[PDB]
């Protein structure tokens, strides 16, 4: 049925520094339009499973 408890981050502003860690969960903003914490086109949740 699928083990959906193992997630990974697929969007970030900039690549990590070595051994750096980032557990935030802010709505990513692809396009120029601001997101205001809601999903939509060019406003994506940053974690997939």
């Amino acid at each position: 049925g699928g083990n959906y408890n193992y997630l990974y981050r697929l969007f970030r502003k900039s690549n990590l520094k070595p051994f750096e860690r980032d557990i935030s969960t802010e709505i990513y903003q692809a396009g120029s339009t601001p997101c205001n914490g809601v999903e939509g086109f060019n406003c994506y949740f940053p974690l997939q499973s």
């Epitope: 049925g1 699928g2 697929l10 994506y44 997939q48 499973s49």
Partner: antibody, heavy 120, light 111 residues
């Protein structure tokens, strides 16, 4: 940069074995996956197996027991041979790459296909 | 060795937005999120659009967006421009270690 290109004939009657190749232009063998994708006229797509490069495989059990894919890494070829065709396999045939490493998946640069009719 | 699901042609006026659906079982699209979309112009070769429910590869407009709810993904176009009249396919990574393609949907920009 990298492009694909089909080959091979098609007009043979019904109940034989056809062949096709997808010689690679820009040069990227030995790193990706490469698969063959059918499409009948006016209908949706389909899928057939792929072949890593070092190892290999085949797929789409519906077409299993008929299809064999092979790879020549030197001159960068995929052979695809289906056997005992049935004139229901009269379709265009693309040879799209695949993608791994950077997950992506789905597919990628395709190859303009090849109308392959099956009849007398 | 079966198939997915998609509606036939849709309609729409320019400048608006539109959303096309792609519904599958919860063993291919529900249980995965490796879905990708493809746009094919009549008599051409399909073109790669976005991998992972959403992620326009560098080279595609930003009028496209992908999303999922559950074993059902969807693609939204914004400001319908009258050159997007094409066919749109979705694909995924069904179990049994295989891929699958949709059924296609003819976009009509309501000329």
């Amino acid at each position: 940069q990298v492009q694909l290109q089909e080959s091979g004939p098609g007009l043979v009657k019904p109940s034989e074995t056809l062949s096709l190749t997808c010689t690679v232009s820009g040069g990227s063998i030995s790193s990706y996956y490469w698969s063959w994708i059918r499409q009948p006229p006016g209908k949706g797509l389909e899928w057939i197996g792929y072949i890593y490069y070092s190892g290999s495989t085949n797929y789409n059990p519906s077409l299993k027991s008929r299809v064999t894919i092979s790879v020549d890494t030197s001159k960068k070829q995929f052979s695809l041979k289906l056997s005992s065709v049935t004139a229901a396999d009269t379709a265009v045939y693309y040879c799209a790459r695949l993608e791994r490493d950077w997950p992506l998946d789905a597919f990628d640069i395709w190859g303009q296909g090849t109308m392959v009719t099956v009849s007398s | 060795q079966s198939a997915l699901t998609q509606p036939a042609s849709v309609s729409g006026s320019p400048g608006q937005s539109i959303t096309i659906s792609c519904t599958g079982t919860s063993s291919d699209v529900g249980g995965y999120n490796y879905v990708s979309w493809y746009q094919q112009h009549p008599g051409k070769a399909p073109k790669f659009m976005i991998y992972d429910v959403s992620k326009r590869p560098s080279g595609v407009s930003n009028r496209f967006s992908g999303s999922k709810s559950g074993n059902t993904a969807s693609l939204t176009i914004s400001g319908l421009q009258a050159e997007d009249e094409a066919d749109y396919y979705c694909s995924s990574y069904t179990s049994n270690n295989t891929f699958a393609f949709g059924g296609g949907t003819k976009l009509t920009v309501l000329g």
